[PDB]
Amino acid sequence: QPNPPDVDAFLDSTLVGDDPALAAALAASDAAELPRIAVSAQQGKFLCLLAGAIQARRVLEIGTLGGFSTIWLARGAGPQGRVVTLEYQPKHAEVARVNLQRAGVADRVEVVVGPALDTLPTLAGGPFDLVFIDADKENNVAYIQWAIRLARRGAVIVVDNVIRGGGILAESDDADAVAARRTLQMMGEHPGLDATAIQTVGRKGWDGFALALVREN
Amino acid sequence: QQPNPPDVDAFLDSTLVGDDPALAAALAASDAAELPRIAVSAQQGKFLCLLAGAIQARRVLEIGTLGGFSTIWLARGAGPQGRVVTLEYQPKHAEVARVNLQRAGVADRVEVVVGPALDTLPTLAGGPFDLVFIDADKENNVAYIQWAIRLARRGAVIVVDNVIRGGGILAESDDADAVAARRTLQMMGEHPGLDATAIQTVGRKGWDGFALALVREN
Ligand SMILES: Nc1ncnc2c1ncn2[C@@H]1O[C@H](CSCC[C@H](N)C(=O)O)[C@@H](O)[C@H]1O
Ligand SMILES: Nc1ncnc2c1ncn2[C@@H]1O[C@H](CSCC[C@H](N)C(=O)O)[C@@H](O)[C@H]1O
Ligand code: NA
Ligand SMILES: [Sr+2]
Ligand SMILES: [Sr+2]
Ligand SMILES: [Sr+2]
Ligand SMILES: [Sr+2]
Ligand SMILES: [Sr+2]
């Protein structure tokens, strides 16, 4: 009788609690008619704790939407950390900037507007400690190649949505399952990466993520 | 037949891990000694390895060794200068694990400490620990987490295995590991020294999940 969404509601109440900044971000995202595809609270808290564990101070995110995952990354990187997040849609970037300011992390985050393949070669500063790749899935492999080039040795790369209900193994007419399957094959074969993939369930259904360490950059 | 999580894990194993004769030998030795086949899956073990590597862990504490499968992955992630202390109360499990760690080339990084963890944890001087993996008798998760906080550095990572148990944490069944998991999660959420999340997983081992926490303060 218990199902993964019910368990996630319990985990949210038990481990995350009331989050008025993310509640406001959801309402603002809804008012702007953004798709409800942001990370769940357990998933966002995972990104936050991952950034905190490695003491990430330079974080790259590809795919901002309304800034939900971005807020979590900025929380984990802390007041000394900086997050650069890339977003193709001007309307998404504008909502995210408002959501970031209301969550109190605007001093830590820059939203860079444009196709990520055009903005990544000009991104400056220093090498990244953590890269979260969550944009157009057909460019996952290009984004991972960029992540390796722009990350420090030992940086963490996280790729969202790599399982898609098992569609990566099924003759499924799902462009992003095709992309996710090729992404996993590329990560396994790449000599500069050491990677794992964890299948997940919860409020967003059966999916999963890839996590890799940059061996050489 | 549509793909299921075990099928997907087999693909992930073949694609991201590949042939691993050290872990193949560890499984075979564990089977030969009739250990329960309840080790972490390869994707789960690799996650522990990459987590230790990501935080550059040099002192790792594991509670619940079995045949050393999770231990091998932790030792791989800690590197040649890293050290793992792993606690096991069954002498036969400890003996199998020591053989498996040697064949995995990590015996010089790992100490298996034999005895009930509640009795050996106060004798440990191998800290402060950077990473604690809690995977032993579930009714003592909460005690082991309290010890982990005491023995860890600030900012250390604590991972607790098997905290979902097929959704049983929401049921009122006389189910020891689900009752313990629910209490474990409630304790972690309430502890002012911990910041925690829990991820539900599927795969070879079915619907389960893990808790991950940062030690915010000793
Ligand atoms: N080529 C591209 N470059 C940058 N962003 C892109 C892109 N293609 C799609 N996107 C953006 O990627 C986002 C994916 S949804 C991202 C969700 C977010 N990470 C969260 O969990 O809260 C969308 O906002 C979409 O506009
Ligand atoms: N009180 C206790 N102290 C130390 N070890 C204990 C214990 N109670 C149970 N155990 C041990 O905990 C182990 C749980 S199975 C551990 C599996 C292992 N972590 C892997 O993934 O490969 C068993 O070997 C069991 O004997
Ligand atoms: Na690889
Ligand atoms: Sr996503
Ligand atoms: Sr079609
Ligand atoms: Sr276990
Ligand atoms: Sr009983
Ligand atoms: Sr049970």
Write a three-state SS string for A161-184: CCCHHHCCCCCCCCHHHHHHHHHH
Mutation target among B200, B208, B215 for the A interface, most CBs of A within 10 A: B200
Cis peptide before A121 (omega within 30 of 0): no
Q: State how far the Cα of A181 lies from the Cα of B116, in Å rounded to an integer.
A: 44
Architecture per CATH, domain A1-217, reads as 3-Layer(aba) Sandwich (3.40)
Contact B19, B58 (CB under 8 A): no
**Which residue from A46, A55, A199 is facing B212, i.e. has the nearest CB?**
A46
Q: Which two tokens stand for residue B145?
A: 């987490």
Please identify which residue in the block is written with the tokens 């250390």.
B156
Sign of the four-CA dihedral B83, B161, A128, A158: positive
Q: State how far the Cα of A91 lies from the Cα of B174, in Å rounded to an integer.
A: 52
Residues with Cβ within 8 Å of A181's Cβ and at least 6 positions away in sequence, in order, are: A168, A169
Q: State how far the Cα of B198 lies from the Cα of A42, in Å rounded to an integer.
A: 6
A15/B197 CB distance under 8 A: yes
Count of C-beta atoms within a 10 Å radius of residue B37: 11
Contact B94, B160 (CB under 8 A): no
Contact B38, B4 (CB under 8 A): no
Please identify which residue in the block is written with the tokens 């993996």.
B133
Contact A156, A213 (CB under 8 A): yes
Residue of B nearest to A155 (CA): B54
Q: How was this structure determined?
A: X-ray
From chain A, the residues in CB contact with B153 under 8 A are: none
Q: Which two tokens stand for residue B8?
A: 């997907």
Residue of A nearest to B215 (CA): A53
Ligand nearest to the CA of A36: 1
b/e code B84-122 from CB counts within 10 Å (16+ = b):
bbbbbbeeebbebbbbbbebbebbebbebbbeebbebbe
In units of Å, what resolution does this entry have?
Answer: 1.6
Q: End-to-end distance of chain A based on CA atoms, in angstroms?
A: 48
Q: State how far the Cα of A11 lies from the Cα of A41, in Å rounded to an integer.
A: 9
Q: State how far the Cα of B116 lies from the Cα of B124, in Å rounded to an integer.
A: 13
Contact A153, A216 (CB under 8 A): yes
Whether residue A41 has its Cβ less than 6 Å from ligand 1: no
Q: What are the distances in angstroms from CA A3 to CA A36, A202, B171?
A: 20, 8, 11
Sign of the four-CA dihedral A8, A14, A15, A20: positive
Q: State how far the Cα of A22 lies from the Cα of A19, in Å rounded to an integer.
A: 6
Whether residue A116 has its Cβ less than 6 Å from ligand 1: yes
Burial-class residue A27 by CB neighbours within 10 Å (0-12, 13-18, 19+). Answer: exposed
Q: Which CATH class is domain B1-218?
A: alpha beta
Query: For residue B205, how many C-alpha atoms fall within 13 Å in the half-sphere facing its CB?
Result: 21
From chain A, the residues in CB contact with B53 under 8 A are: 154, 194, 213
Q: Are strands A82-87 and A109-113 parallel, antiparallel or unpaired?
A: parallel
